[PDB]
Amino acid sequence: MQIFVKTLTGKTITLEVEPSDTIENVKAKIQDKEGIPPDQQRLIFAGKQLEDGRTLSDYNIQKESTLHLVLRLRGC
Amino acid sequence: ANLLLQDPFGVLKEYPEKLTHTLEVPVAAVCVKFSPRGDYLAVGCSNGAIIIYDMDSLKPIAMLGTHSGAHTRSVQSVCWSNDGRYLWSSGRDWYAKLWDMTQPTKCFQQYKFDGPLWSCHVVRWNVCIVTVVEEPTAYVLTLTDRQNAFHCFPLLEQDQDISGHGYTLVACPHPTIESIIITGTSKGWINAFQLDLEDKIRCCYEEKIANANIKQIIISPSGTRIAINGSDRTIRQYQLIVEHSVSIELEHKYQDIINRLQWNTIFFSNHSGEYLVASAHGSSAHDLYLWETSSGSLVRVLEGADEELLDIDWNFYSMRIASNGFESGWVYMWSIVIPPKWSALAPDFEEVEENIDYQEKENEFDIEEIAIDLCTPEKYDVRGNDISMPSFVIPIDYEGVIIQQHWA
Amino acid sequence: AKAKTRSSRAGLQFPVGRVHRLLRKGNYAERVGAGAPVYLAAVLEYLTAEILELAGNAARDNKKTRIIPRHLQLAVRNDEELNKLLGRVTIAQGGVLPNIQSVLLPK
Amino acid sequence: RHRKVLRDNIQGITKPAIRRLARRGGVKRISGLIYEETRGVLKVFLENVIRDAVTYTEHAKRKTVTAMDVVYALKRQGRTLYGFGG
Amino acid sequence: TRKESYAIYVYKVLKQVHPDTGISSKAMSIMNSFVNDVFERIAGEASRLAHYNKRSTITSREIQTAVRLLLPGELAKHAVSEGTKAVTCYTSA
Amino acid sequence: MLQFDKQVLPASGKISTSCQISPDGELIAICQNTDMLVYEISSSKMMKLTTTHKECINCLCWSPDSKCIASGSEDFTVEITHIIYGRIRRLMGHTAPVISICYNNKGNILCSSSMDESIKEWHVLSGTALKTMSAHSDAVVSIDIPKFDSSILSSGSYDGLIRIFDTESGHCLKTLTYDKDWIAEDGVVPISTVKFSRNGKFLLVKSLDNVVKLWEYTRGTVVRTFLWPKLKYNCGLELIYPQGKDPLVISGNDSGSMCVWNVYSKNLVQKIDEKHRNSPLISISASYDKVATLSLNGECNLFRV
Amino acid sequence: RYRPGTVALREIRRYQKSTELLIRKLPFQRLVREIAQDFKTDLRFQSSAVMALQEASEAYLVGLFEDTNLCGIHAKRVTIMPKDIQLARRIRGER
């Protein structure tokens, strides 16, 4: 099923995931689409920061939701 | 804390960058310490006051020290109880006043010491570790069941002399163990004494890091990293491991390379200490620093104030940085400043920042029984905090409010 | 950022190879600190960034893509504290700031 | 020991003093609105020279603003001063 | 012959603030000769300043007193901040 | 599930506007014109009190520790008075009348409405003006704070709007419906009373067409509606708290008929009509187990699970 | 009683012929410490480095008044005014 991982400054992506996918599985898909490493990613849903080991079903993520991604660029 | 649940998103950034507030406190102030929740800000003052502000309108709710137990001399430190109800406050009047906000201006109990005081740090609301001047042990002040006898157990094993290791000047209790308290000598050794809360105290760690006069020791709130502030111009963050048997190793060092200056105070972030915030010492040091504690580099610099800054407090519930003025006495305050949104005006508004290419659909030319609960308060907020353990609200002095309209 | 080409390590654009050469074959002092050309290249890049930003802004506000010296005078002299750094200097081919003193307008 | 932040010593550059200063500048009649304008001018001159006087000392890590540092502050703004050396 | 200038290094900063614009060569010779002025003005002042104090090394501490003198007002505070941030990144890495 | 315990007050007399039980659940303040009837529920004792106010006091707010009562009326007076020690403070700020106010959950910032499309904020001890909140287009009737934290301020008003504000910096934060403009329909039914819940995650609204809805504002949409088997009263609303699992919403009709809705369904189970049957109802409140009623004639009626 | 304006010319020649300092010392040395408060706190002033600031501020104001009085004369009058001082500073570059 389809999600948005719409990032803080204003633009959206379109991913294909399963609700049984891990967040790190979704964080892998962002990295395949952006090169941004999964350790610098925080995925936010209903204001709640989702953990790498948990699934999409755990957080009541439904079809065509908007997820929030907040990268932390290293350094300097 | 429900503002941030819909503020909306875009507030988790783990520092504040704009200074938003300024407590124009005329009587200059050394130490500042927020409440355990974001409610109040205690302001340790120079002339013996301890002003207590309500953080919501930047104006005080009381100034304790009227009825009993005013700190006559300058106050160096103030901590709070685990809930936010009591308040230990160590000053230079040789007293360590434990306050109770319930009976606000009246001290709960005090104790006369061997000299002036450097700090205090509260482990359980009664017991408190207090640093006597130039004494090779710290006299832990355990407020017993009887209010007259505080057994000042020496925080030192019976025969392990630390002459050549130094003199105890700081002690910060470990958060996630709560029985080990790490204490800093004056010649670089760091003693780690595990209280049994009997009085046996195992020396879990005694080691010199560098031949410096230790100024301040802080722990991350997850006890993982520990940073030390030497008298050399260096900050030494370690990696703390305890089950007891305790062990550290040098993760990184922090130094002013250009200006080559001293560090006044240092502070750690909420969760695991991903950020260190330090205040430099010399002239032209107008700004707190930030450090990515893993990469080791100077990530950001919080360019707010106009002159040196002494004490740093970081109440993560409000995500604020209180920072007292070294010169003016004024109390600068940074704050994560949210901007408004006009998408709050209507329930179908939307704020885009690009000229979006809306793609044509067809019909532009064509003409509840779910689970409802009202009983549980929310357990967490967007920062993962311990909300819904109801904080001790201030009791507004309702014995003296009735005159308080007339002449203070 | 990288490990070669010492400007890469500071993460700058202005070279620290060229600057550190030019601080020793310029006879400013005897021994140039190894930190010194980095800090000097950081200040130079910042000014070249700030003066190219206000130049480019005034180039789109006159509808043109590239930057000609008439934009550089407008970037400097309209600014409050870049004009003061460049007070005595004169930019070639670079017009004047338009102003007319008040009593010259009719009434 | 004692703690004073100064207030309004610019009123020490006195109305007769700005008159004597004007006399050496060769003027006959001084409008009464000069005496709050010269004070404005002087307070701007003193700032830029002290801010460079201090910046030199603060580099050399001192707490006394010595006479050569004042002179280098003047020498930098193209006011060179000749009775204090170097 | 090879006669070095800051032609490219100015261009690489133009592509970082305004990534769509270009620059005429006559207004590149200005920037080529603006930096060569601020260089010889900062390294000048930072070498009267290492000689009044009888040092013989241009450290990175002279270059920030020299910038806090020449650059006025808010260009001082910013170019100090972007100064120290770029020397810290040098030493650490 | 719920029944009548006792009626202790006689009906007629002066204008009865507000009834509020203090959160300790034993001290009730009946608000009439410039006099406060205090009724201790223990031995059904009585107590009379009088304020320094002049006109019809439309508002009432209890202290969270039951040690103060403040009130605002249409003559711009905003008075803060002690329950035993009398008048202590006063604020005097608004440029239009005030209808309702509420204390903070800390008791330190009473929120305060005006009718000229502006909510204003006061710190009680400093007695000055903090933040202005002027985002509305009508007489703003009810501004409610949740019982548990004091984070947010919901503003329902006579222009038919449900707009959530900020209390820290004071911007509007969420809207749940449309205005005169932006639909143009006659679906701009004004809102009479907005009430938060006990925990504060769900809102309750009562629009001027006697239809009560319960909003899940975090998601933006509604989950409950309550109708009776057009109004011209600013009648009171509450949600009763029985120790059973289902806590019932309560509102009053144009007449003195009060039915109680099963909130876990969308229907009723019960209706209270044996009291207030002469007089029309303007306000209600509750306590852990001691709910009062009111109408233009002040008959307070205890009930219990 | 002299004619108004002739004590002036008897006072111009007197000051121009001598070289003592025209601002009082102590009301100046206090002004320098007031202004040095902003840039650093509790400075000491090596006490010939205030004489180095009278002699460079007095000799600046006097060179400004020589350039003010030329502007007042140029506006066909003999009384300097603050709309002259602000001109002389604007022409030299200072303001």
Curated annotation (Swiss-Prot), chain D:
The modification N6-glutaryllysine is found at K15, K43, K61, K63, K75. The modification N6-butyryllysine is found at K15, K28, K61, K63, K75. The modification N6-methylated lysine is found at K4. The modification N6-acetyllysine is found at K15, K43, K63, K75. The modification N6-methyllysine is found at K4. Its main location: nucleus. It is found in: Nucleus; Chromosome. The modification Phosphotyrosine is found at Y35, Y72. It comes from the Eukaryota. There is a cross-link at K75 (Glycyl lysine isopeptide (Lys-Gly) (interchain with G-Cter in ubiquitin)). The modification N6-(2-hydroxyisobutyryl)lysine is found at K15, K28, K43, K61, K63, K75. Residues 1-4 bind DNA. There is a cross-link at K15 (Glycyl lysine isopeptide (Lys-Gly) (interchain with G-Cter in UFM1)). The modification Phosphoserine is found at S31. The modification N6,N6-dimethyllysine is found at K4. The modification N6-propionyllysine is found at K15, K28, K61, K63, K75. Core component of nucleosome. Nucleosomes wrap and compact DNA into chromatin, limiting DNA accessibility to the cellular machineries which require DNA as a template. Histones thereby play a central role in transcription regulation, DNA repair, DNA replication and chromosomal stability. DNA accessibility is regulated via a complex set of post-translational modifications of histones, also called histone code, and nucleosome remodeling. Belongs to the histone H4 family. The nucleosome is a histone octamer containing two molecules each of H2A, H2B, H3 and H4 assembled in one H3-H4 heterotetramer and two H2A-H2B heterodimers. The octamer wraps approximately 147 bp of DNA. This is Histone H4. It comes from Xenopus laevis. The lineage of its organism: Eukaryota, Metazoa, Chordata, Craniata, Vertebrata.
